[PDB]
Design a protein around this ligand. Structure first.
Ligand SMILES: Cc1ccncc1NC(=O)Cc1cc(Cl)cc(NS(N)(=O)=O)c1
Ligand SMILES: Cc1ccncc1NC(=O)Cc1cc(Cl)cc(NS(N)(=O)=O)c1
Lengths: 304, 304
């Protein structure tokens, strides 16, 4: 009973967080095995951030300039390198708390948990999605850089995001754990517009199935539609086009509820065309798009 | 930048979760020091749940009947007792992962994180509030009993909730860690109506301050009100009456933003009387009430 925006348990990731200081800048690092990963802008001063030449700035830094602290103890840095927009600090000790892990680059529409950290200390955990414009709508303040996004499959943590910056519009941009930014963003203090933030249609449909499973059914109608007819409606409302791949991924939810995917699309079409008329679905007065079909199956089945 | 429904990092609590089996029933237990806490209905069969005499059922159970497993290893039960609606199983080993902790009984309106668990394994973490009718709107399935709610102050975990049951309306009821139910609920399979679920006014005001801090300001108006005038509006909309204690707790938010509490109440009065007119506040199309003033200060300041 009930349906909530649920994050993964954060313990496996909390044991990887460290504080990295270079010069006068402090941010978060991720310690896995004998490497600490952090945003390369740790080597910058505020004056450098306008037009930084990271390669030239890094020449002036040596291993002893990177101060890595795990809780109360200091890690010894025996190597440093830059991989895209991240620094990899080789330390002399493997993290004993390193979980089984992978580095994954997610697609827009996919969700993940964020463990917001400051000074290497965790402050909170929340669930979010990689938006279609490659931004995330997080909750981050100065010092939160280096906080990571992840998914967990039983015992393996798949790290997908490392926080780097806030855009002038208060949305967030970052990299995968190979240091490649999601979207066209650069790690420079220059105004960068985000792009159209469309609604993740397949996720809205998944959430409507979650609503039916949990009893919220008022939006079910006597209609059906086609992929092309639904997509005309989706275009008008800045919803992502629905493909047969999306319909296929909703299969387990269609099977569990007995509601055909195209019938659920006709429900969504009517909700887009008429609004909610002051009503709510799963405690929300808007159509929620940050639950994937996998998230809905996981939560509705109790996967640990 | 940004404002999210954030839960506490769950690591300290994940290290306390165990699986408790009695007869054919399995649920979650909380292992702190040498005691495992779990809902007493672990001793019941489905047939017992209609009208159980817990004292009589417990007479037929011995220490060896309680199977406690922490991860893959078995804990030895050397004592058992019932405290209100919880069982306390004394084990021969102290939990090495026991964090600094306290047991607290929260007031309605207060928020906490829930670490949903199944078979002693964590599945997810989410933030919720103790509703004014003493129910919680969680996300729990069969096997989730014994999952706990908590708050964290630096290194100390304050456990406030242990999950016991779902009401026929799909809302959730449970106890504090002394085994006393929140509200009038009993651990018996008998239909128990919840009570009016009013809106936590002080929390809505806190969230409106969070919205102003993060840039959502369209709802600020040229009006003011009084506590008695606002409370006439709050009564009409099933909002909790606002007291001077609530106004006092909003003081830090009033000080940070420069918006007097009664001016923010006039904004809330107009939102109640006119609705949002298709607009949103912090990504929501309804007035959010599961952020306390302390939660807003914590998130907006970055407390770890
Ligand atoms: C203050 C803060 C809040 C949340 N998350 C992160 C931060 N910190 C930053 O964004 C620092 C930073 C780094 C880079 Cl690579 C670029 C900028 N560009 S800007 N935002 O237009 O000035 C700023
Ligand atoms: C199935 C489930 C889902 C979520 N959370 C918990 C559960 N399990 C339960 O509630 C079992 C249980 C225990 C008690 Cl003490 C009473 C009842 N009464 S009822 N709901 O009206 O049948 C049921």
């Amino acid at each position: 009973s009930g349906f909530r925006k649920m994050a993964f348990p954060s313990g496996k990731v909390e044991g990887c967080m460290v504080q990295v200081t270079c010069g006068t800048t402090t941010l978060n690092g991720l310690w896995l095995d004998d490497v600490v990963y952090c945003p390369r802008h740790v080597i910058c001063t505020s004056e450098d951030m306008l037009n930084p030449n990271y390669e030239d700035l890094l020449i002036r830094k040596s291993n002893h300039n990177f101060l890595v602290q795990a809780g109360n103890v200091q890690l010894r840095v025996i190597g440093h390198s830059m991989q895209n927009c991240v620094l990899k600090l080789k330390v002399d000790t493997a993290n004993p708390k390193t979980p089984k892990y992978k580095f994954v680059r997610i697609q827009p529409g996919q969700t993940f948990s964020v463990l917001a950290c400051y000074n290497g200390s965790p402050s909170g955990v929340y669930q979010c999605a990689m938006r279609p414009n490659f931004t995330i709508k997080g909750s981050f303040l100065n010092g939160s850089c280096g906080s990571v996004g992840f998914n967990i499959d039983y015992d393996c943590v798949s790290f997908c995001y490392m926080h780097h910056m806030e855009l002038p519009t208060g949305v967030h941009a970052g990299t995968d754990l190979e240091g490649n930014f999601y979207g066209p963003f650069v790690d420079r203090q220059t105004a960068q517009a985000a792009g159209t933030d469309t609604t993740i249609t397949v996720n809205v449909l998944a959430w409507l199935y979650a609503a039916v499973i949990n009893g919220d059914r008022w939006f079910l109608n006597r209609f059906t539609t086609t992929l092309n007819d639904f997509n005309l409606v989706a275009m008008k409302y800045n919803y992502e086009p629905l493909t047969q791949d999306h319909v296929d991924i909703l299969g387990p939810l269609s099977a569990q509820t007995g509601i055909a995917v195209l019938d659920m699309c006709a429900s969504l079409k009517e909700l887009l065309q008429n609004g909610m008329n002051g009503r709510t679905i799963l405690g929300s007065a808007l159509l929620e798009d940050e639950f994937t079909p996998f998230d809905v199956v996981r939560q509705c089945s109790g996967v640990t």
